[PDB]
Structures are given as structure tokens and as C-alpha cells.
Design a binder for this molecule. Structure first.
Ligand SMILES: *[C@@H]1O[C@H](CO)[C@@H](O[C@@H]2O[C@H](CO)[C@@H](O)[C@H](O)[C@H]2NC(C)=O)[C@H](O)[C@H]1NC(C)=O
Ligand SMILES: *[C@@H]1O[C@H](CO)[C@@H](O[C@@H]2O[C@H](CO)[C@@H](O)[C@H](O)[C@H]2NC(C)=O)[C@H](O)[C@H]1NC(C)=O
Ligand SMILES: *[C@@H]1O[C@H](CO)[C@@H](O[C@@H]2O[C@H](CO)[C@@H](O)[C@H](O)[C@H]2NC(C)=O)[C@H](O)[C@H]1NC(C)=O
Ligand SMILES: *[C@@H]1O[C@H](CO)[C@@H](O[C@@H]2O[C@H](CO)[C@@H](O)[C@H](O)[C@H]2NC(C)=O)[C@H](O)[C@H]1NC(C)=O
Ligand SMILES: *[C@@H]1O[C@H](CO)[C@@H](O[C@@H]2O[C@H](CO)[C@@H](O)[C@H](O)[C@H]2NC(C)=O)[C@H](O)[C@H]1NC(C)=O
Ligand SMILES: *[C@@H]1O[C@H](CO)[C@@H](O)[C@H](O)[C@H]1NC(C)=O
Ligand SMILES: *[C@@H]1O[C@H](CO)[C@@H](O)[C@H](O)[C@H]1NC(C)=O
Ligand SMILES: *[C@@H]1O[C@H](CO)[C@@H](O)[C@H](O)[C@H]1NC(C)=O
Lengths: 73, 312, 224, 34
């Protein structure tokens, strides 16, 4: 119902501890989205895919295939 | 030192030009288009400042975590990588820069907080550092790979015209020289910031001038708009009131133009810093004297308040 | 070659389908120009503190000696509005000039050649760019080269065959568990370590990491 | 220049490119071993 964040007071949307991607920005590292009925939820934006690259002093990765991608600017 | 963002602000007319009087709002309707222009310009400036952080730090959509193995062939990364002793994610160097560089919301000149916090900027810099010391350039140009840092440094040596047989024969010397250079720049950075302190001082000076212009009569018989209303009568003091509104409007337009010029300069600096990151950080730029004086090998970005530094 | 041609055709069809589903950079400047034009037309509907908006009404109901102050006030209000519009147009023109300089550099480098700078002509290794006509702008079809599938390998920075260290000229020593091969850093092309692709530089007692490998020496079999 | 081994590298089989021609290589180490 009523949520208090760093960027003021936010009403009309609940707060969820889960972190997803940021669609509609709000401020101070918190965004809102219309997810699952369904309602607007305010949450901390995810910074990306949390993955760890296996690094070793005798380990290398050589690609074996490729995709020809075209990007429109 | 290259600044990428400045202080975001929002200034309205009913809180700055007008006070607690109703006739000011009635006379402000004839200049409502100007206030709409200024509000739209300030909103666009805030949007531009929010976008500038994304183009510089958010170059990778995947977060890379530093492996627990700190054996990088002799290269000491303690100062650039975050430490687990401090709860904050700032690197030792970042912590030094945070304290190195140093209300105005009284009259409605509120400050919009940035979309990306300093912790998130530090996390972005740490992810970029982890990607650089584990893949070199493949994490910024497609799928992330793995490579030892000795082989990555030999690859960086091959990009300037020097073969790789001069690296492994004196790898200890190169590692010691790199550690000594990191210690030297750490010691020299503790002694202030030129580019970063200029924009903050300019914004503070602009805000101080904005609140100081309210104490000027602008040719009228009073400075505040309440004294003329309390002492004089409305229909004969309307000229003094209108003079106050047009003086405050001229001051606000001058402030808006100055902030627009400063925002254009900030966008140019942010584009320059983003290009520097994309070339020198996410790879090896072949342009001479672009990533530093000499033959560039690699760069380590570090988080800074309202800016970013590069350790080429 | 057929696979790469099919991938390029599929990418062209994919961006054609995606672009048919609006534009951000091109539609922004048109919207700003339209808003500025609309504000310029709507400015004359105000009074700027005077008793009338149109000069005809005040000039009709009041004599020009009486209308002198109102006409001057309208003159200075419209002058301020025109000055603000000109300043905004100058800032926008500077932004468009910077964008056009960036697009001209992009056309000079990525279109008229292969730019060696990364992350400037699309994400990944740039190959070529195809410019297309756009209203009040230009777009570039940045044909890039990115890796898709990789494998984990064991690497050695040098090879000591007969007391001398061997280093790859362009490739890198990789292993799949039993044998050792050399391949480029952008594709997996395992090759037998020979004299042609490896050069001798000093002895093998100066590098921290090395493996005990051999050299095929293709000169030797053809000598018999 | 005369097409030799030094400036040409071999890779793959022959029936992999749609456009190929028949030619000879000087093999600059063959006359030296005589
Ligand atoms: C590299 O990737 C391409 C594209 O995914 C692969 O091409 C596909 O191959 C499968 C089986 O050979 C076919 O069923 C698909 O129709 C192909 N797709 C296209 C677009 O041509 C290719 O096989 C991959 N190469 C390797 C060595 O894995
Ligand atoms: C990397 O550099 C840091 C310097 O910041 C080293 O940390 C120092 O280690 C010495 C040795 O005991 C201590 O006396 C100092 O107090 C440490 N300084 C700090 C700030 O912690 C660190 O040992 C170096 N690591 C390697 C592997 O060389
Ligand atoms: C690693 O790759 C090598 C090269 O292909 C493999 O060695 C060959 O293996 C095949 C059968 O697996 C044999 O017929 C060849 O004679 C081998 N080549 C040589 C030079 O001996 C090797 O098997 C691969 N390793 C693994 C674990 O698959
Ligand atoms: C690679 O092979 C060489 C020669 O067989 C090894 O060198 C010998 O190492 C042993 C013990 O490590 C010494 O007792 C000998 O004196 C060495 N001989 C020479 C000629 O150097 C070398 O150790 C091998 N590499 C590894 C990693 O085991
Ligand atoms: C290039 O040389 C190859 C082999 O020397 C030729 O292939 C032969 O073609 C004839 C007639 O087309 C066949 O009878 C043989 O069986 C083929 N041999 C092989 C090994 O494929 C080829 O025709 C030559 N190309 C040209 C243009 O003359
Ligand atoms: C390489 O190994 C790491 C962990 O050992 C794993 O996460 C990664 O998926 C492996 N790479 C491939 C291509 O299988
Ligand atoms: C890699 O590092 C580990 C940990 O120190 C060490 O045991 C191993 O010998 C190293 N390998 C090489 C090839 O240097
Ligand atoms: C070139 O194209 C023509 C037109 O189809 C074709 O007849 C010819 O065989 C082609 N040559 C090569 C070498 O591909």
C-alpha cells in the first residue's frame, strides 16, 4: 500500500524483496514494474546476470563457432 | 579525470518566483509558457544526466564476480579490487577518491537523486575490473572467455609492436614495476582533483547566485514580495510586482541557459569518457596518445563521485 | 561460406522484422521542433502583463499614445520569447552538429573500411556497415562478428622442446587433455606444433609456466 | 611473385570452396636437397 524509499514516499504499489530488471525508473536504485492477479511492484533494480567466470592460471577458452549479427544504430 | 555527471536539480516558478501569495500565480499565467519551457529543459537535463551514467558504466549486461584466487602471476590488484573488510563495495582507491572531493533546497531548488547510486557505480566498476582481469577484451565484444593474466598481458604487448618473448623472460620485473606504479599513483592521489571539483563548485555557485537574486529589488522599492503587498495596495503595487516577476524570470532564464551549456559540456565529457572506456578498457586502442602518453596496454576504471577516473 | 551467407540473410530478415514492429533518435528531434513551434504560435495568445493580447484590439479601443506602453511591453515580451527560442534552437543545432560529426566519422570509418576500434561500429568484432537513407537522419547496419560456442582448454605460454623455449607467432598453445595444439584467439583451428608457427627465444628456464612438448620439425621427414 | 610455400598456407581439403583453380607450387626446398 504505502512504501517509503530514499526518493520519497511511494503509494499505490507494494514492495517486494525480489530483484528484477528495471523497466520504469523511480530513483535511488529502485524501479517499478507491472508484474504478477497483477499489480505494480517496487523493487531494487538488478545489475545484470550474477555469474562468476572460472579463472585459472592454466585455463583458456577458445571459441569454436560464431554468429553473424547485425546491429542497427 | 573525466566527469560524467553533475548534480540533478528541479526548479519551478510557483516556489521560486512566487511565494505564499495568490496574485503572483494569477500574474504568472501570462508567463506560463516560459515556465513550461524551463521545466521541460530541466526535465530533459535530468534525463540526460541519468542517461550519461548508463553510457559510461553500463557497458556490459552481465555481472562478473572476482574469483577467490588472487594469484594473477605476480600482479597485485589489492588497490583496484574491492576489499571484504569494508562493507561498502568501493575499492581502496575509490575510498580515497570519495573523501578527496567534497542547504540549497530552502527556496524550492530541490536536488533529484541519481538513478544509479554510488554503490551501484562501484559494483559496475568492480564487474568491469573482474571482466578485464579474466578475459581482457572478449567479455566486451561477445561471449565472455577465460585467460590467464600473464597471457593477457602478453597479448596486450603484441598490440603495440612488441613480441611476447620479452614478457615471460622478465615477468617478475613487469609485475614489480606495475605494483610500484600503482603504489606511486596511490601516494600521489592522496596529496586536489581538478576536473571533478570544478563542476561541483560551479553548480554550488549557480545555486548560491539563484538564492542571492531573491534579495535584489531589481529596481523596485522592496526585495521581498510580501512587504509591498502588506504596505502598499494591490492595483498600484502591481507594477513593482511585475518588475519582480520579470527580473526573477530573467535570472531563471540566465540560470537555465548556463545549466544547458554546462549540461552540453557534461554530455561531451561523458561521451569522451564512454569512448575511452570502450576503447582502452574493453580492449586495446591502437590510437596513439589517446589512452595516455606512450604505448597503451590496458586501463582500470574506478568509481568517482559524479565522475570516473582511468588508470591506464 | 553458405553458412555465413545464410546467417547474414537471417540477420537481415530479423532486423527487417524487428524494425517493422518506434524510432527513438529520429522521432525525438521532430517532437522537440514541433513543441517549440507550437509554443511559438501559442506565445502570441498571452498578454505579457498588458491589457490585451492582439495589438489590433488595444490599438483600436485606445489611441497609439495610450497604447505606447502596451505595444512596447508586447514588443519586449515577444523579443524575449524569440531570444529564448533562438537560444534553444542554437543549443539543439550544436547537438545536431555533434551528432552529424559522429555520423560522418562513422561513415568514414565503419562504412568506408574496417575500423580497428572496438565498440564503435557495433558490439563485437566489426566487419562492415551498410548505411540506409532516413528522414532527417541516417542509420547503419553494423555487420558484426561475435563468438557463440566456446570450450574450456588448458593453456601453456611456452614450449621447451630441446632446452629452448618455443612461442606461438599468432596462435596459442591449447590442450584437450592428452595432446597439444595451436589455434587463433577468435576461432578453434587446432594445428600440429611445428617450426613454421613457433620461434625460439632463449632457453626454457626463465618462464614460470611451461610444459614438456615436442616439435614435429617438417624439414626432417622430407630430408630422407 | 612465384607462388611458393612461404607465402601460402594450407588448410582443409580441396572440395570445400565453390571457386577453386588448378595450379602448382614451386616447393622452394625441393631443389636444395638435390
Ligand atoms: C554454428 O552455428 C550455426 C548456427 O546455429 C550452426 O548451423 C546450424 O547447424 C544445424 C545442424 O548442423 C542446422 O540444423 C541448422 O539449420 C544450422 N543453422 C543455420 C542458421 O545454418 C552450425 O552447425 C554451428 N557449427 C558448429 C560447429 O556447431
Ligand atoms: C598488495 O599491496 C598491498 C598494499 O596496499 C599490500 O598490503 C600491505 O602488505 C604489507 C605486508 O605485510 C603490510 O605491511 C601493509 O600494511 C599492507 N597494506 C595495506 C594497505 O593493507 C599487499 O600485501 C600486496 N599484496 C601482494 C600479493 O603483494
Ligand atoms: C584430443 O584431440 C586429439 C586430436 O584429435 C585426439 O587425438 C586423436 O584421437 C583419435 C581418436 O580419438 C586418434 O585416432 C588419433 O590418432 C589421435 N591423434 C593423435 C595425434 O594421436 C585426442 O583423442 C583428443 N582427446 C580426447 C580426450 O578426446
Ligand atoms: C621436462 O623434462 C626435463 C628433462 O627430462 C626435466 O628436467 C629434469 O628435471 C629433473 C627433476 O625435475 C632434474 O633432476 C633433471 O636434472 C632435469 N634435467 C634437465 C636436463 O633439466 C623437467 O623437470 C621436465 N619438466 C617438468 C615440469 O617436470
Ligand atoms: C583440376 O584437377 C582435378 C584433379 O587433377 C580435376 O578433377 C578431375 O576431373 C576429371 C574430369 O572432370 C575426372 O575424371 C577426375 O576423376 C577428377 N579427379 C579428381 C581427383 O577429382 C579437375 O577437373 C581439374 N579442374 C580443371 C578446371 O581442369
Ligand atoms: C568451464 O568450466 C567452468 C567451471 O569449471 C564452467 O562454469 C564453464 O561452463 C566451462 N565452460 C564450458 C564451455 O563448458
Ligand atoms: C597455478 O597456481 C596454483 C596455485 O598457486 C599452483 O599450484 C600451480 O602450480 C599454478 N600453475 C602454473 C602453471 O603456474
Ligand atoms: C561466376 O558467376 C557466373 C554466373 O553464374 C558463373 O557462370 C560462373 O561459373 C561463376 N564463376 C565462379 C568461379 O564462381
Amino acid at each position: 500500500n504505502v512504501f517509503q524509499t530514499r526518493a520519497g514516499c511511494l503509494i499505490g504499489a507494494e514492495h517486494v524483496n525480489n530483484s528484477y530488471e528495471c523497466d520504469i525508473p523511480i530513483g535511488a536504485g529502485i524501479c517499478a514494474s507491472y508484474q504478477t492477479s497483477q499489480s505494480i511492484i517496487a523493487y531494487t533494480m538488478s545489475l545484470g546476470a550474477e555469474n562468476s567466470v572460472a579463472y585459472s592460471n592454466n585455463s583458456i577458452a577458445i571459441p569454436t563457432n560464431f554468429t553473424i549479427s547485425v546491429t542497427t544504430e | 579525470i573525466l566527469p560524467v555527471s553533475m548534480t540533478k536539480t528541479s526548479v519551478d516558478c510557483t516556489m521560486y518566483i512566487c511565494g505564499d501569495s495568490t496574485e503572483c500565480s494569477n500574474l504568472l499565467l501570462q508567463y506560463g509558457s516560459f515556465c513550461t519551457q524551463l521545466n521541460r529543459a530541466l526535465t530533459g537535463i535530468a534525463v540526460e544526466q541519468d542517461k550519461n551514467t548508463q553510457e559510461v558504466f553500463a557497458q556490459v549486461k552481465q555481472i562478473y564476480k572476482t574469483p577467490p584466487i588472487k594469484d594473477f602471476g605476480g600482479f597485485n590488484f589489492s588497490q583496484i579490487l574491492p576489499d571484504p573488510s569494508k562493507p561498502s563495495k568501493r575499492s581502496p582507491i575509490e575510498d580515497l577518491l570519495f573523501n578527496k572531493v567534497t542547504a540549497q533546497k530552502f527556496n524550492g531548488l530541490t536536488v533529484l537523486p541519481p538513478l544509479l547510486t554510488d554503490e551501484m557505480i562501484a559494483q559496475y566498476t568492480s564487474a568491469l575490473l573482474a571482466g578485464t582481469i579474466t578475459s581482457g577484451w572478449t567479455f566486451g565484444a561477445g561471449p565472455a572467455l577465460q585467460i590467464p593474466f600473464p597471457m593477457q598481458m602478453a597479448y596486450r604487448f603484441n598490440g603495440i609492436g612488441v613480441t611476447q618473448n620479452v614478457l615471460y623472460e622478465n615477468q617478475k620485473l613487469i609485475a614489480n614495476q606495475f605494483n610500484s606504479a600503482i603504489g606511486k599513483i596511490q601516494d600521489s592521489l592522496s596529496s586536489a582533483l581538478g576536473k571533478l571539483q570544478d563542476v561541483v563548485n560551479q553548480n554550488a555557485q549557480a545555486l548560491n547566485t539563484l538564492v542571492k537574486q531573491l534579495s535584489s529589488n531589481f529596481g523596485a522599492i522592496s526585495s521581498v514580495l510580501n512587504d509591498i503587498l502588506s504596505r502598499l495596495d494591490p492595483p498600484e503595487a502591481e507594477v513593482q510586482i511585475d518588475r519582480l516577476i520579470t527580473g526573477r524570470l530573467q535570472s531563471l532564464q540566465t540560470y537555465v541557459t548556463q545549466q544547458l551549456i554546462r549540461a552540453a559540456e557534461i554530455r561531451a565529457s561523458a561521451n569522451l569518457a564512454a569512448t575511452k572506456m570502450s576503447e582502452c578498457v574493453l580492449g586495446q586502442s591502437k590510437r596513439v596518445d589517446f589512452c595516455g602518453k606512450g604505448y597503451h596496454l590496458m586501463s582500470f576504471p574506478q568509481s568517482a563521485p559524479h565522475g570516473v577516473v582511468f588508470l591506464h | 561460406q553458405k553458412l555465413i551467407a545464410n546467417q547474414f540473410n537471417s540477420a537481415i530478415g530479423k532486423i527487417q522484422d524487428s524494425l517493422s514492429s518506434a524510432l527513438g533518435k529520429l522521432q525525438d528531434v521532430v517532437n522537440q521542433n514541433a513543441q517549440a513551434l507550437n509554443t511559438l504560435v501559442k506565445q502570441l495568445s498571452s498578454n505579457f502583463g498588458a491589457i490585451s493580447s492582439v495589438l489590433n484590439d488595444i490599438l483600436s479601443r485606445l489611441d497609439p499614445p495610450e497604447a505606447e506602453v502596451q505595444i512596447d511591453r508586447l514588443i519586449t515580451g515577444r523579443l524575449q520569447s524569440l531570444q529564448t527560442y533562438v537560444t534553444q534552437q542554437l543549443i539543439r543545432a550544436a547537438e545536431i552538429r555533434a551528432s552529424a560529426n559522429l555520423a560522418a566519422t562513422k561513415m568514414s570509418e565503419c562504412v568506408l573500411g574496417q575500423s580497428k576500434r572496438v565498440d564503435f561500429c557495433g558490439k563485437g568484432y566489426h566487419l562492415m556497415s551498410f548505411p540506409q537513407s532516413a528522414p532527417h537522419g541516417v542509420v547503419f547496419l553494423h555487420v558484426t562478428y561475435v563468438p557463440a560456442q566456446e570450450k574450456n582448454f588448458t593453456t601453456a605460454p611456452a614450449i621447451c622442446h630441446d632446452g629452448k623455449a618455443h612461442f606461438p607467432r599468432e596462435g596459442v598453445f591449447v590442450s584437450n587433455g592428452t595432446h597439444w595444439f595451436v589455434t587463433q584467439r577468435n576461432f578453434y583451428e587446432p594445428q600440429i606444433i611445428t617450426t613454421d608457427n613457433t620461434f625460439v627465444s632463449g632457453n626454457c628456464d626463465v618462464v614460470i609456466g611451461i610444459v614438456n612438448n615436442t616439435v614435429y620439425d617438417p624439414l626432417q621427414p622430407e630430408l630422407d
